[PDB]
Point group: D2
Chain length 232, copies 4
């Protein structure tokens, strides 16, 4: 006798192309059920994915959210997708490699507002500031940028914002000469997890992003160091 | 640029937990201790977090969790922060026909936050239950489709609530409860009662939410239910949220 | 001064394109584990080679192409022994039983290739299926059923499309799995499960039977897990036959 | 057809473990109990498997592990079977210089197998350690490039405490791990790990020497993953050795 804000499918694995790049994405498609209805065409959620096509595009994602709301005869819902994203970048001096970043594109239709969010987990390098000054500790960190979008924003732009405010970016292949630069860059710029977040937010604190949730996790100890800063 | 959450993550440490009855259960809790850093400050004492779990000695009780939050806040010289411990819980149960005593696993998460001098204490429990699809017993001459289900109950608490009391609500409001040890009688009463009580992922959350609304000890809750479909590799999901003050 | 059996990279995730049994192409993302062997004398390996080899490659991975990659590494890494492993999600167009509506199903496919003094090639298939206990029906109107995982690791003597192992498993379970199933189709899947109930042992035995008959599988290890719906524990059954 | 392993999987049931000193430790383990099914009999009694865990008393010692193993063989009426449990283990360590203490998390998988009258018993430990680069340090003017996991699955010839298996990995690495660390303790770990850089290739060989010596261990499978901090992949190394050969 009460409304179920999210009713739907979860963990739907089905291929997906983005732009071009073919990946595989896991879907979480859901709709809101009113207080008087009792069921939903969960089969339609599958039929959508299995029939939809085209490179996913800001516009194709917005249309896919709309088609769902009709196919399911609904007024609110969300389309969530988690897929691997790669980027062919160049070495700092070598000229050479592809890196894996996990992206999450989410779009909800509530109160006549189709809000498009996007998140990317980026591998980045960090170096302790206390050590070095304390002594005569360069682990890897995971930066998560969940950005509420006011206008279209590429994921590689967000990836660039994170790798550009860190002791060092990550490269799959790094010739031995490059290793020096990457290793010596941290020695110069000791980055405290407490600071990397502050610095990263400043780049988003950007108008294509009205709101965001940015988290930095360092893999020190067998524990971890985590900082999150939300906004509006 | 203030930092809303700054602390440690993924600290594992043994833990003692006290039940509704005079039973204390020893578990392993992975802790995530965090605080708030304003713009005036520019760094926190990470080591202090790790010290409070080692320093403390006792059975995590509803009052011991409160003191911990404050303790942490003072030991770091802050006025806001959060504490989350994820531990595995267990309850001895009597099988439906046998009465055989078997232990069932439960995933409990104790969280507590302080913001603006207000301490919201929340409790999430992952409850394993059985689901039987309603349009399978009426669409088919013989049989029905059954899967395992995950019922998650995150609840802001206005009062102490036993985690077993949250398990008792959901297990009662489902097609059939889970038991580790069952024999031929046990597995007969189980199968038949579930066919007799078929429910949707849509129905499950509603039945539970109503029992939740009869508990004034829970001011707010976020209910969730996943059905690991037997006929599909995908799962089904339903979610309900409620701030009773609105 | 000790032979390090296999040293190399692990968890290298890289995009891959694989030709199917139909000749068609399947683009998936696979995580790679490329390693080499260090004799008692050699003390170090140029780890960077593995990474390069992956990105500087080209061509849809094939039975012949995969064997070639193992050979190329052995030269790029100055080695006589190495192992290359790729684990990737794979999909097939499964058509519904009664409505004929087609839909894709997920299958984790792991491909292992080893070249140690004889190049042994393997294939792993994870078949999700429905299980039904044969002792819930006889104990009236009612059965306990759930999802199951059939794992088939097979050493290849000739080319064997994974699709040839899925069918067997899907056919040897009480019911196969479908993503898009309409009301007419959700009744044949709920009935045949009652009709063809099967224990975890009754299942594994039925599957391994055609594996030793496939004759292109030199060896195999078959697993099956029932994610029981009446317990929080999973039923298991593993059978290992070499026949060599 | 005969099936080698048939049984339960992923049963969570609290357990108590014996520490070297003799003290006890409470943990929660995931038990995987399985048997060998002959072509003669179609049905195992799976239930019993859960009954054997609930009907248990006291700490998992070396004799209690073999007792359980056997007791389950008689309750299930079989001639072969395996029992595996994986539990978190903790050790009250001492910070290098300040003496502040901290518990460290270790993953211990205890395997036991009766087959053909011979009861084999194995022990696996994952030890969280630090590694540094015997290539980045010198080649670079300043700075060093991560945490690693060392896994030692050892076939035991006699009763061996897991802490002794933990000691070999923590000592033959660059540095060990600590939960709580002071300022004087964080300066010794940064230099002494840098002063003693060891490769993944160098890490595994150094441990095996000690393993090859301990006559308590007849066979072992040694693994090492360095979880690279400059890269999105990890380094792997494996050693295999049944001295009886
Ligand atoms: C240690 C040496 C280095 O400078 O960084 C490393 C390399 C060996 C091992 C490893 C962690 C990486 C693989 C390629 C490489 C350049 C990285
Ligand atoms: C009973 C009905 C059915 O047969 O199909 C199932 C089930 C409803 C819930 C759910 C587990 C399934 C998702 C899609 C599907 C068709 C549903
Ligand atoms: C036939 C099953 C039943 O009714 O309950 C049992 C039988 C075996 C299959 C099933 C998945 C489980 C595991 C163990 C158990 C007692 C349960
Ligand atoms: O490095 S700090 O967490 O002691
Ligand atoms: Mn530090």
């Amino acid at each position: 006798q009460m409304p179920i804000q999210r009713v739907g499918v979860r963990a739907v694995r089905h291929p997906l192309t983005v732009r071009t790049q073919a990946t595989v994405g896991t879907w979480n498609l859901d709709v809101h059920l009113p207080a008087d209805q009792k069921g939903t065409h969960m089969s339609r959620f599958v039929a959508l994915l299995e029939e939809r096509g085209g490179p996913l595009t800001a516009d194709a994602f917005r249309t896919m959210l709309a088609t769902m709301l009709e196919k399911l005869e609904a007024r609110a819902g969300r389309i969530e997708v988690s897929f691997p994203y790669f980027v062919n970048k160049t070495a700092p001096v070598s000229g050479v490699s592809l890196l894996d970043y996990e992206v999450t594109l989410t779009g909800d239709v509530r109160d006549g507002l189709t809000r498009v969010f996007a998140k990317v987990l980026v591998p980045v390098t960090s170096l302790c500031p206390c050590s070095k000054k304390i002594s005569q500790h360069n682990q890897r960190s995971h930066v998560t940028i969940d950005a509420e979008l006011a206008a279209d924003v590429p994921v590689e732009d967000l990836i660039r914002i994170a790798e550009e405010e860190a002791s060092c970016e990550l490269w799959g292949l790094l010739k031995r000469p490059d290793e020096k630069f990457v290793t010596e860059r941290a020695y110069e710029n000791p980055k405290f997890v407490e600071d990397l977040v502050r610095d990263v937010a400043r780049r988003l604190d950007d108008e294509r992003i009205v709101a965001y949730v940015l988290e930095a996790e360092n893999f020190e100890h067998n524990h971890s160091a985590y900082a999150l800063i939300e906004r509006d």
